[PDB]
Ligand binder design. Structure first.
Ligand SMILES: Nc1ncnc2c1ncn2[C@@H]1O[C@H](COP(=O)(O)OP(=O)(O)OC[C@H]2O[C@@H]([n+]3cccc(C(=O)O)c3)[C@H](O)[C@@H]2O)[C@@H](O)[C@H]1O
Ligand SMILES: Nc1ncnc2c1ncn2[C@@H]1O[C@H](COP(=O)(O)OP(=O)(O)OC[C@H]2O[C@@H]([n+]3cccc(C(=O)O)c3)[C@H](O)[C@@H]2O)[C@@H](O)[C@H]1O
Ligand SMILES: Nc1ncnc2c1ncn2[C@@H]1O[C@H](COP(=O)(O)O)[C@@H](O)[C@H]1O
Ligand SMILES: Nc1ncnc2c1ncn2[C@@H]1O[C@H](COP(=O)(O)O)[C@@H](O)[C@H]1O
Lengths: 650, 658, 339
């Protein structure tokens, strides 16, 4: 396998194009269309979508009904079809075409010298600035074939274009208004199998209309778990009554992959790599999507499937796609602030309920001066405040065995602080056992043991502080040890997020300037990754595994694109340059071997008996009662073997 | 509410009746039917099912086609209907009735002076000793109405008789052969709602046929999550070519509630209380049952529902049902022997897999001399033997704080044994914590108890790390139920729990079974027997009572007053019902309502509110009982932060003080 | 004619196999499947039924949704298909397979180098210890085809596999829970023609469950006048929350032909000679069975019949069947006392 090929990792390269319109001149439009398709071809694109009525112009009104115009459109269309014999992508081009009694507003799907199909617009707006039913017939409910340059090709609203060599790529096409009605053709098509939904638009621009386009193309792509590929008309359409902004865009399950300049000078393309495996993984897990199909079975079973062989380029063509280094940490500051606000209020409100339900017990917690326990102590405090409970009901413990930040934060917040040296107890235990992991574990164990007994003694509960990345990797001490508690507030927060939560608490500043300074000190001081690898890379793989179940080679491909060059892509706030590492393939490959071994084989038993705590990230959590049911007794051989066979050594 | 009324606890009393046949003489058969129905009424029955072609006799062949016979049947049927005005139960009576062109083999459903409906047999056997298509027409596909004594009443294979005051009682009726075809009318009727399936049979007896009847009525009742009420013809049928055994029976979800004497002299009845709530609870939970209905929706939606008001007796009429004292421990020795063999092989095979998967680590376990840990050590040994591992890889520990059976069993099995006294460590820990006892105070609270339980687990765990072993849990299912364990750092935690799915009441019989089988040898046998004798904490109540409630809650979700009723019927008299093997008379307690009520308050509080958090973070171990287990990854998903108020209030309002 | 050949007297030799499960490792499971299939071949068996989700392991939960796992299953399944080119028996193997939007819990029917069909479980328990709807889609009402290693093969709950040279052998396949609902797929298939009903089961063992299996597989075989061939998962399934007893069994019109050791150490097979003429003879005489089909004609006419040529061994291969000397006098004393 070619590891650097996007097509070999399930990507499909898609283009929404806005061409130069020459109204009433099909050969001119076709020439503009041919030039942009040759570009999409050079880019290795599999699909190029053009605007509504591309070949005539959308704005020409009663001129659509002129024989010479209709005739010119057919001739021009046929020329394009001929030219497509040497073009890689499927081209989806608008044309007014005659069929039976009328003309239809159609998209012609063209590929490698043939027309695969012809799709008529279903819903023809005849209100406000739109007059479409005057010239054109509704296509909803039309099936059968249409004759195009001596051949009968499939015609109708029930068509699916499936790549026989790219099973993840199933195209449905609809037109402009089709997307705006309470039950759009594209939503039935997704249920029936379509993964990529194209829209050819005219869409005269009005104040606020671009927002409406986005709202509907975006929600479509989220509701239908699909890529949505959208092209509107631009320069050249008539301005007798309307203006045109040429907007093009590509959405994937709710996220914007690419858009182009509004009101441009000259032609514009959006080009993106769509991840068919992402779409496939979401559909795999959301059972209710398939239930919805089954409830509408007669609607969804009636589609006709037109097969074609794409034969994509096999080499390196790069990756036209923003892959963030931190799935859990948005690079966009306004987004990351939102995430932090939500994470924090999840941890707090979850603890508050547990405390209300237990009639407000004291809160016992071991504070070491580290990031996790520090953050947990802040969570605990806010929870107690919110519930009108004295901060002295928090019992914080230093438990040194064989920092000041700890006692300072505690003092600054005004919780009850105390120290208990576990060394002598550990010595006694080591001796009694006749005594590495055991040495380490005897101390970790006695910490938990003490807290638990103090909790019994003082009418408290022990607060866990292990974080999501530690659960993922089994980096914790099971049972009698830090893995155990009465309630875990960090269980759902990945390590890479924790530092930004603390930053957010500081920046918000409701704990006061002292607390602020201590927390800032914790940060400066604190920033294991020796033996389990850098947490940036493990949190990366964790997301891919937990959200999508992607195979290891696909994970390596994504990580390498995100991390391999520190200069490319954006970093979140809070990364000075001395701390913007870049990773080689060899490194990514190494830590990924370690990740699959620890995640799939070693660590599950530790997750299996997990204390309570709230789920936090949309990426998922690792509760055996929630997002992650798995065997405690399984080997990781197949994952290790996949890496061995598919990921180059470096 | 009347706590002693079976009807108020969701029971329906049902009768399968075999009457005296007088072939060719409807008024005589009717008179036998009326006499048994008056009995079934006196018993407070809600339903009385009779045999196929009751009113004419099943065996009369072409005489069925004689007008005087057909006429006599109608007159006799109409007399019954009139008499039923003063009878409590719905009567289901067989009759050849004329409809359109032919006679149908039918069941007439009669209630309080009206005919509620008429059901024709669907499949008429015309092979071997059966000739039914010669005289009678197939009823499959017939709908509409039939005229009976001046009234149009529902006729067809699509009928459901629903009690308007007893929602759990929905009756469907089929006939004889109907139950034997690959897709029987009653299976569709169950999907559509029927909870009680009646079968009128003729069923000439042949060698082996009684077994076939049972196999099909039983599997029916299990697949359809229903009661199945079956009545065959007996004395009086013609013996020109056949004989008749009069068999009657009542099945409920796979279990036999009642059967009557085969080949009797005189009439016979089976009468049982059917638990509609048990049926309701199983349908509530088995989602795929409802999925099956949805898949056959056009079949299942077309049923016609005929409503009637039963108005059952409200007082104490007893409880015609065998309620076992020990849901987890069958009183039948052959049954209990089976259950033990299975429980034991479940425990062992589960541990073996964990051991194989961990490449055969040592097994660490704390042995106290008690029932649980003893049994666990036995389990562990057998697992190691089966995997061909040396018994010395089992590391057993005595861990005295502040027995010999323990060291003896260890020595007898040949596992590695050792002692570690946790006293000093506990002393140090109590002092470090500032607990009054480290200063001499005789304060033996939860912290004092817990410091010791904790250190036990803590030691085992560190030994496991040190010696490349895993810690075996030994807490049992009843302890998980009640939260009777020490959470987290304490006996609740381990690497693998073999007893997690076995209730306390079962454990002692598992040990007995291991002794009785005797493959560990006579020494081990003697030590185990000593553990039993020695070992046979009621702040949580008698485990017999809590295991009882646990089964009701975990399997059916029954309300507390229903549980009290059941437990009182099972436990209140030590002379009635059977005890399992191994209960000398000095140990056959009987409980009062007041007692049952007391321990039940404690059960609901502990089960639904206090203990879930301890179940929530549970080690791995195999499910054992069909009653269910308590793994939050398996049979029991529940909140760790809920109150038990409604349960406690239900007891307060519904269960008498004594 | 060869008087000593069981195949010439209307017998079909059938095997229910419980293999060594390696959870999450399809090439290992396929290797255990291939070894047992070679044995069934050497025995002259015409059919070998394996347990539910054979190729992945039944007990792996969310691991089923992992691309590497789904991928490994496909590669392993295609290796088996290739190996089957030299194997006599039809192989019925379990596999989680992707189709349309989801994965289905399926049985793949394999024969002489081809996949004859792919059958999805219809009813997916999601109660008590079972969580199937979480990972897998219900197969009831699915028809059409599925693409398996470059070919379109029949997919759905409506399939019959008929031996073109052994008219009495018509196979229907269902899965686990399918057999436990009031109106099971297998009862409509019998009405439609199936004489041999296979069941691939996971079936974690609980106290009393073995009795439930028997009651339902036995009553199914008696009600449907059929052979019922049943295989449950054993050693190697996860014991995170459940245990497994590896039970296999073969029923014929209400009678047990063969069963294997519960909780065995190592792999186990039941192997029996099913008498297709016996089944044929009972259906010939019990007219109400055909009446029942006619009453459900639209249900029963819709099945698709996939034809294959078995070409069984023609020589003496003995007779794996208890033939009592006295049809009228049972050799079992408890039974004879009853009679
Ligand atoms: N599948 C399975 N099912 C049941 N038991 C299983 C098991 N696999 C191992 N076991 C048993 O469980 C035990 C091993 O697990 P465990 O007791 O946790 O010990 P283990 O994971 O081997 O070691 C804990 C490690 O976590 C690291 N740690 C922990 C806590 C904090 C920090 C820090 O950053 O400061 C680091 C530390 O480096 C240490 O190396 C052994 O008894 C083993 O036999
Ligand atoms: N809902 C909830 N979520 C999270 N945490 C919760 C909680 N409710 C209490 N807690 C906390 O849990 C702790 C109380 O539970 P836990 O630590 O287990 O202790 P707890 O159940 O209060 O006491 C143990 C009891 O079990 C009996 N016991 C123990 C061990 C063995 C045996 C035997 O002989 O078989 C009997 C013993 O006599 C004692 O009465 C407290 O620290 C409390 O604040
Ligand atoms: N020296 C220490 N004193 C008190 N608590 C500690 C100390 N070291 C670690 N902990 C606590 O032990 C848990 C796990 O930390 P660690 O083992 O350092 O990753 C957290 O709750 C820490 O606060
Ligand atoms: N004296 C003891 N020696 C060894 N193990 C014990 C001892 N006491 C308790 N245990 C362990 O703790 C479990 C719970 O019993 P207990 O803690 O005594 O309530 C037992 O089943 C043993 O596994």
């Amino acid at each position: 396998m070619n590891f650097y090929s996007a097509y070999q990792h399930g990507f499909v390269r898609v283009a929404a194009c806005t061409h130069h319109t020459t109204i009433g001149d099909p050969a001119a439009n076709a020439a503009s269309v041919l030039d942009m398709a040759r570009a999409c071809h050079d880019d290795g694109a599999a699909l190029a979508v053009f605007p509504e009525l591309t070949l005539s112009g959308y704005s020409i009104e009663d001129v659509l009904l002129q024989d010479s115009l209709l005739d010119a459109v057919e001739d021009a269309l046929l020329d394009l079809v001929t030219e497509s014999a040497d073009l890689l992508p499927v081209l989806v081009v608008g044309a007014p075409l005659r069929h039976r009694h009328r003309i239809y507003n159609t998209a012609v799907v063209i590929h490698r010298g043939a027309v695969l199909g012809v799709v008529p617009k279903s819903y023809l707006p005849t209100y406000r600035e739109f007059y479409e039913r005057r010239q054109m017939a509704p296509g909803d409910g039309e099936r059968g074939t249409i004759r195009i340059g001596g051949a009968d090709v499939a015609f109708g609203t029930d068509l699916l274009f499936a790549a026989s060599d790219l099973p993840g790529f199933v195209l449905h096409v609809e037109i402009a208004e089709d997307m705006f009605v309470p039950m759009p053709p594209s939503a039935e098509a997704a249920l029936a199998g379509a993964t990529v939904l194209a829209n050819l638009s005219g869409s005269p621009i009005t104040i606020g209309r671009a927002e409406d386009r986005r709202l509907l193309a975006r929600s479509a792509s989220a509701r239908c778990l699909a890529a949505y590929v959208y092209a509107a008309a631009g320069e050249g359409e008539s301005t007798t009554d309307l203006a045109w902004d040429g907007q093009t865009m590509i959405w994937e399950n709710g996220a914007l992959l690419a858009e182009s300049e509004r009101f441009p000078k000259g032609v514009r393309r959006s080009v993106a790599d769509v991840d068919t495996e992402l779409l496939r993984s979401e559909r795999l897990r959301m059972g209710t999507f398939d239930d919805n199909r089954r409830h509408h079975r007669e609607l969804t079973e009636s589609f006709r499937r037109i097969d074609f062989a794409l034969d994509p380029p096999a080499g390196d063509i790069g990756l036209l796609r923003e892959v963030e280094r931190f799935p859990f940490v948005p690079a966009d500051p306004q987004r990351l602030q939102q995430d932090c606000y939500e994470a924090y209020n999840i941890q707090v409100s979850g603890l508050e309920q547990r405390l209300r339900a237990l009639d407000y017990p004291k809160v016992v917690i071991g504070v070491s001066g580290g990031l996790d326990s520090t953050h947990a102590l802040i969570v605990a405090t806010h929870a107690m405040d919110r519930e009108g409970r004295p901060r002295s009901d928090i019992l914080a413990f230093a438990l040194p065995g064989f920092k000041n930040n700890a006692i300072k934060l505690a003092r600054a917040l005004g919780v009850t602080f105390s120290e208990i040296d576990i060394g002598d107890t550990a010595r006694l235990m080591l001796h009694t056992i006749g005594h590495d992991v055991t040495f380490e574990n005897v101390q970790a164990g006695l910490r938990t043991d003490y807290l638990f007994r103090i909790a019994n003694q003082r009418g408290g509960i022990v607060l866990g502080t292990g974080d999501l990345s530690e659960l993922a990797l089994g980096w914790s001490t099971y049972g009698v040890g830090d893995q155990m508690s009465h309630y875990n507030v960090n269980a759902g927060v990945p390590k890479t997020l924790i530092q930004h939560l603390i930053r957010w608490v500081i920046s918000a500043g409701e704990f006061g300037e002292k607390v602020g300074e201590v927390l800032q000190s914790v940060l400066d001081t604190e920033i294991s990754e020796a033996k389990v690898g850098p947490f940036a890379l493990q949190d990366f793989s964790l997301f891919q595994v937990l959200r999508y179940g992607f195979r290891p080679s696909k994970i390596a491909f994504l990580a390498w694109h995100a991390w391999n060059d520190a200069e490319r892509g954006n970093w979140p706030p809070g990364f000075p340059k001395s701390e913007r590492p870049s990773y080689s393939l060899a490194e990514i490959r190494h830590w990924l071997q370690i990740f699959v071994q620890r995640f799939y084989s070693f660590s599950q038993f530790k997750r299996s008996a997990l204390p309570n705590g709230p789920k936090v990230s949309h990426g998922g959590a690792l509760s055996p009662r929630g997002d992650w049911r798995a065997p405690s007794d399984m080997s990781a051989r197949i994952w290790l073997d996949q890496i061995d066979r598919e990921v180059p050594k470096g």
